[PDB]
Design a protein around this ligand. Sequence first.
Ligand SMILES: *[C@@H]1O[C@H](CO)[C@@H](O)[C@H](O)[C@H]1NC(C)=O
Ligand SMILES: *[C@@H]1O[C@H](CO)[C@@H](O)[C@H](O)[C@H]1NC(C)=O
Lengths: 49, 50
Amino acid sequence: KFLPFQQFGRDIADTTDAVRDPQTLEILDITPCSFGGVSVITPGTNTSN
Amino acid sequence: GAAAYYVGYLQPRTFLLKYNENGTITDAVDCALDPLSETKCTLKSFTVEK
Ligand SMILES: *[C@@H]1O[C@H](CO)[C@@H](O)[C@H](O)[C@H]1NC(C)=O
Ligand SMILES: *[C@@H]1O[C@H](CO)[C@@H](O)[C@H](O)[C@H]1NC(C)=O
């Protein structure tokens, strides 16, 4: 929920919740998508590649 | 006619401003009123344990 005099959003990390959308008052919630991981499970360069 | 008014001065000061879920100011505590107000503000919480 937001109020007319509250068009900027930031809780602790200054997230881009302040997109009040002056064009068409529409507060948007910014959030990065999945980061991802990586790890190689290999039986060694001796057995097989 | 008849009427009345108040006159009072204001000075700088810092409180702990509490906003509920809706987004409306409901609870405020200053730092220059009581030791509790003080120790309460530093902990950034309205509840202080023993
Ligand atoms: C490579 O062969 C096996 C693979 O499991 C390994 O146990 C051995 O120690 C290795 N030997 C040499 C000569 O690379
Ligand atoms: C803020 O809370 C609700 C928002 O859902 C609103 O209906 C209500 O009038 C406001 N005040 C209180 C005390 O809930």
